Design a protein around this nucleic acid. Structure first.
Ligand code: MG
Ligand code: MG
Ligand code: MG
Ligand code: MG
Ligand code: MG
Ligand code: MG
Ligand code: MG
Ligand code: MG
Ligand code: MG
Ligand code: MG
Ligand code: MG
Ligand code: MG
Ligand code: MG
Ligand code: MG
Ligand code: MG
Ligand code: MG
Ligand code: MG
Ligand code: MG
Ligand code: MG
Ligand code: MG
Ligand code: MG
Ligand code: MG
Ligand code: MG
Ligand code: MG
Ligand code: MG
Ligand code: MG
Ligand code: MG
Ligand code: MG
Ligand code: MG
Ligand code: MG
Ligand code: MG
Ligand code: MG
Ligand code: MG
Ligand code: MG
Ligand code: MG
Ligand code: MG
Ligand code: MG
Ligand code: MG
Ligand code: MG
Ligand code: MG
Ligand code: MG
Ligand code: MG
Ligand code: MG
Ligand code: MG
Ligand code: MG
Ligand code: MG
Ligand code: MG
Ligand code: MG
Ligand code: MG
Ligand code: MG
Ligand code: MG
Ligand code: MG
Ligand code: MG
Ligand code: MG
Ligand code: MG
Ligand code: MG
Ligand code: MG
Ligand code: MG
Ligand code: MG
Ligand code: MG
Ligand code: MG
Ligand code: MG
Ligand code: MG
Ligand code: MG
Ligand code: MG
Ligand code: MG
Lengths: 110, 93, 54
RNA sequence: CAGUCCGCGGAGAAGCCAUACCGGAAGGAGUGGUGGAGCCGACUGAAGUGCGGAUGCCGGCAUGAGUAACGAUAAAAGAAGUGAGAAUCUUCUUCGCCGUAAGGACAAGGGUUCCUGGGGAAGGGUCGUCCGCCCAGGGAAAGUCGGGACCUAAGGUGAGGCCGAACGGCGCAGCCGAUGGACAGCAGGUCAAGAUUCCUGCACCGAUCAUGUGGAGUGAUGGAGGGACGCAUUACGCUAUCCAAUGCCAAGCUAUGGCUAUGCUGGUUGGUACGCUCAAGGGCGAUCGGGUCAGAAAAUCUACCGGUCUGCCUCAGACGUAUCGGGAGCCGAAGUUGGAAACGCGACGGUGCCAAGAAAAGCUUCUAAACGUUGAAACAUGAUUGCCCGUACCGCAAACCGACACAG
RNA sequence: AGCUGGAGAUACGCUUUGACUCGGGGAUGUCCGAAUGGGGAAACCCACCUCGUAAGAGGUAUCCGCAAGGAUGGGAACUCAGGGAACUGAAACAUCUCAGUACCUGAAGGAGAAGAAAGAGAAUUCGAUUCCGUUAGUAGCGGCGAGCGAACCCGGAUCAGCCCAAACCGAAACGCUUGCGUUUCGGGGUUGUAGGACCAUCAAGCCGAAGUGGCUGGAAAGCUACACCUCAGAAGGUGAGAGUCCUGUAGGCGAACGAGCCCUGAGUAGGUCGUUGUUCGUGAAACGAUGACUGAAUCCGCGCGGACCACCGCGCAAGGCUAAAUACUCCCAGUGACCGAUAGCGCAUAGUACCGUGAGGGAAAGGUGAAAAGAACCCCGGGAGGGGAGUGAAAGAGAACCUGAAACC
């Protein structure tokens, strides 16, 4: 029993955001946020290939399958990129209405 | 008002074999008295009741994962109608 | 008029319970969604009770 | 453990493991092997700081040892089945053991142990395909049975009331409180598993209302009766219930040496309604009137007191007719005669005894007040109403009390 | 922008006309329980009265009071109060101590108590109460034994003193031989260097500066070459050790509703008898304190100054209220030369399992891995277990999942 968020159930990425990996064998690979699990700190991007095996199970079928699937990861990907990759994120710039806090590195958005 | 009283129709082969005879049985809230459940049937389905019986049923005491517990206590209640029986045609189909 | 819609909700809610004892229950969500409409109902009634009468 | 230095470490820390090296000892190094994430050395500071013992404590593992036993000396044997596997589970045919029990029904008390389908770890003193064990799902029905919506005993309460450093101790009425009083149905059928509950047949109870008879008096938290009670013996009738037979009915054989049925086996009535049918036994006297001083006053009801003339009521149970069941059996036969006989029924019987044997409501009878006396009390029929809790299963025991599938 | 409790599991779905989650109020809130319509073996039985269509709602205990409106019960430790031990020490043991300890019972609050001098005291000083230091083991008490043990001065924490009876006016109602006096209301009146009459910010939260390439490796946060930020190098997460990846931190903002500074007290003062508190055990025993019986004085008056007397000083009793400094810690935050699974609370959770008719007693605790990628598939076996294969850095990690010492086999 240890919550796993030392990061206050905050998340630096939205669902569907393009993202690059900092660390692990995936460092420098690219992916949109397919699933964002805040409190557990789990992040899914396409390309985190993992070979789950099962034709032991009956429910899908009397056999089953080995199959390729995603393996969700820690907020140890870079949250957001740009023509410059990686890098941190300034916020609080205004949208066309200004009601959307936004993002920038050197400068930009999203 | 009274739809809440009728917890669920009883399933099972015996309740079906009785349902062939024109008597119907359901679980009702344990607090329920005979008169209110007779009236709740006469409201919920529009037939006249002609006979009744009821029986409190303590739940089977069951256990998962070395956690032992009592299950909810039901109250079964069986009722026979006059010649305008057949209830709503929700039989075995 | 409020009690009429309450009881109309209660009837189908019990109908859902009756099917749920059986193998038919394809849309369990409609269960809890039927109950909040009851609660909201009652709640709004209380919200009128104090109003006007003070 | 702490402060400060020096540093080391996934080319791998502590810890664990060998080791012939090193200091005078407590000790400490070198190298190797696990290990996989923290840690050594120096100086200082503080301590829960050094274990062989305490019939020490928590823990694990030995010896006794494959030893004693496997929980009544009421024995078991063959076939056949299932199955991965069977001395043990299923079935069949013999065998043996209890039979005022070792059968059955209840109360407790336990709580799903009940039934069905499945399972095989552990529980079962061996096995296990099985179980009272594990899993899932069903089963539990009441106007009439027990309790409650009635009553009271002991006892416990207890406004008022009597006391007492406090908390509290008593305590009249009333109330609670069954082990007792009171009260309406029996016969049959059946889920795998419920039954005076459900179904079938036909009863009863109270309540409300209607139709009608009647067409007027009802008649209380108060009075009165009664309910209301001991023990031992014992007369008469009877039932339950069991015995006999050349009674009836049903079914078939038999053979071994015989019996050819007069042999063998089995059955041989339960409820209800109606009787100018038979019946022991049991109960009961009956009004008119007087007195106030009796029941608070009342009273047409009780008590006291005086006068007045076998009979009634009753069915225990039997017998007949009908009917509704059941009924051996291959849908349905017969239901006789004689006898025995309860602690049960008639009854609250007789007789004897002394130790002199609950209360209370229901209930019957009276008036008080009040309500009326041309929509009474009551009765008859129809209809309508019938609430709560309990009910499975074990229940002289493998399911309760004995730490156990316990010789209690 | 996710959510759909732990809970790890599927299906059904909710959400950018704002979900969830977080702070703030509202509204529902079955039955027991002070339980309170009545009963009762808690969580269940049985009623009555008004709404009256019915489903459904409200009332029906006792105590104080007209009437509002209070009260009953609960609360870890803390407070005050009514009762009040015994082991034990005394190397025995009665007085003594252990001790007004433990315990029971009552009242109450976030505190409580106490408190505004008929005082301490010996300078003709002090000027409420509480608490700390000290005076000081001084005085003193004690089978003068074991032992028990003050107070003033002085130094701090905190310091506020306010109100009524009573002489006197106005009655008003009632009490009597006639402009008067029992308890009620306003005025006025509160004392000792005598007074007074009547006549001269924190809450939910938002913003938040700064690093990249090569190397080892399974992995980068290590090493390394160059940098940058710092009112931020507290900390925790990330595949290993990250100021510059995340969350944060310093700083700054932050709300509709939200909590929080001639009189002056009599059945009494006093006394005798029984007793007791402070160091006070009858001692020369004052004083307070009350059970019993008694029973004064008024301002040229009353109590005390430790038997008692005179003098000399301190003070005005018999009516009340009064924050703060003080105690505790059920609960919250922070911190630690505190523990780290026999330690540490009994519990890494459980007052559970279990033991007891009961009051009550009362446990063991843990560890895959980075992430489940939690072992497809094949083999022997009903299994269980195992061998291959794969996943993974490691299967010298495989769910009887960190290490894996010793007994023992
Ligand atoms: Mg396999
Ligand atoms: Mg019935
Ligand atoms: Mg298990
Ligand atoms: Mg190494
Ligand atoms: Mg060594
Ligand atoms: Mg590691
Ligand atoms: Mg260490
Ligand atoms: Mg020690
Ligand atoms: Mg020694
Ligand atoms: Mg030892
Ligand atoms: Mg031992
Ligand atoms: Mg031998
Ligand atoms: Mg032997
Ligand atoms: Mg033996
Ligand atoms: Mg056999
Ligand atoms: Mg054979
Ligand atoms: Mg076979
Ligand atoms: Mg086997
Ligand atoms: Mg056969
Ligand atoms: Mg028996
Ligand atoms: Mg029972
Ligand atoms: Mg069985
Ligand atoms: Mg079975
Ligand atoms: Mg087995
Ligand atoms: Mg075995
Ligand atoms: Mg057997
Ligand atoms: Mg019943
Ligand atoms: Mg019946
Ligand atoms: Mg009864
Ligand atoms: Mg009493
Ligand atoms: Mg009784
Ligand atoms: Mg009885
Ligand atoms: Mg009866
Ligand atoms: Mg059948
Ligand atoms: Mg049976
Ligand atoms: Mg006798
Ligand atoms: Mg013969
Ligand atoms: Mg008469
Ligand atoms: Mg007998
Ligand atoms: Mg009575
Ligand atoms: Mg039975
Ligand atoms: Mg039962
Ligand atoms: Mg024993
Ligand atoms: Mg036995
Ligand atoms: Mg989860
Ligand atoms: Mg009550
Ligand atoms: Mg009570
Ligand atoms: Mg001593
Ligand atoms: Mg002593
Ligand atoms: Mg105490
Ligand atoms: Mg107390
Ligand atoms: Mg209190
Ligand atoms: Mg460098
Ligand atoms: Mg860090
Ligand atoms: Mg004295
Ligand atoms: Mg002395
Ligand atoms: Mg511990
Ligand atoms: Mg250990
Ligand atoms: Mg404990
Ligand atoms: Mg238990
Ligand atoms: Mg295994
Ligand atoms: Mg291994
Ligand atoms: Mg290992
Ligand atoms: Mg495993
Ligand atoms: Mg590890
Ligand atoms: Mg291990």
């Amino acid at each position: 029993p240890s919550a796993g968020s030392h990061h206050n159930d905050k998340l630096h990425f939205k669902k569907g955001d393009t993202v690059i990996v900092l660390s692990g064998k995936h460092k420098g690979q690219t992916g949109k946020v397919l699933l964002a699990l805040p409190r557990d700190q789990k992040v899914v991007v396409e390309g985190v290939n993992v070979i789950t095996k099962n034709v032991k199970p009956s429910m899908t079928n009397p056999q089953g399958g080995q199959e390729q699937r995603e393996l969700a990861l820690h907020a140890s990907k870079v949250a957001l990129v740009d023509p410059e990759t990686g890098k941190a994120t300034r916020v609080r710039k205004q949208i066309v209405d200004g009601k959307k806090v936004r993002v920038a590195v050197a400068s930009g958005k999203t | 008002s009274h739809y809440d009283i009728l917890q669920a129709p009883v399933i099972s082969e015996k309740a079906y074999s009785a349902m062939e005879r024109g008597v119907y049985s359901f679980w009702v809230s344990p607090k329920a008295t005979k008169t209110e459940i007779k009236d709740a049937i006469q409201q919920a389905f529009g037939v006249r009741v002609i006979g009744i019986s009821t029986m409190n049923v303590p739940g089977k005491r069951k256990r998962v994962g070395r956690f032992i517990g009592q299950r909810n206590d039901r109250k079964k209640a069986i009722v026979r109608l006059a010649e305008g029986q057949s209830i709503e045609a929700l039989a075995g189909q | 008029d409020f009690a009429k819609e309450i009881d109309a909700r209660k009837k189908e809610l019990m109908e859902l319970r009756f099917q749920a004892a059986a193998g038919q229950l394809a849309q369990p969500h409609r269960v809890r969604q039927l109950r909040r409409e009851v609660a909201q109902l009652n709640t709004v009634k209380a919200e009128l009770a104090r109003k006007g009468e003070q």
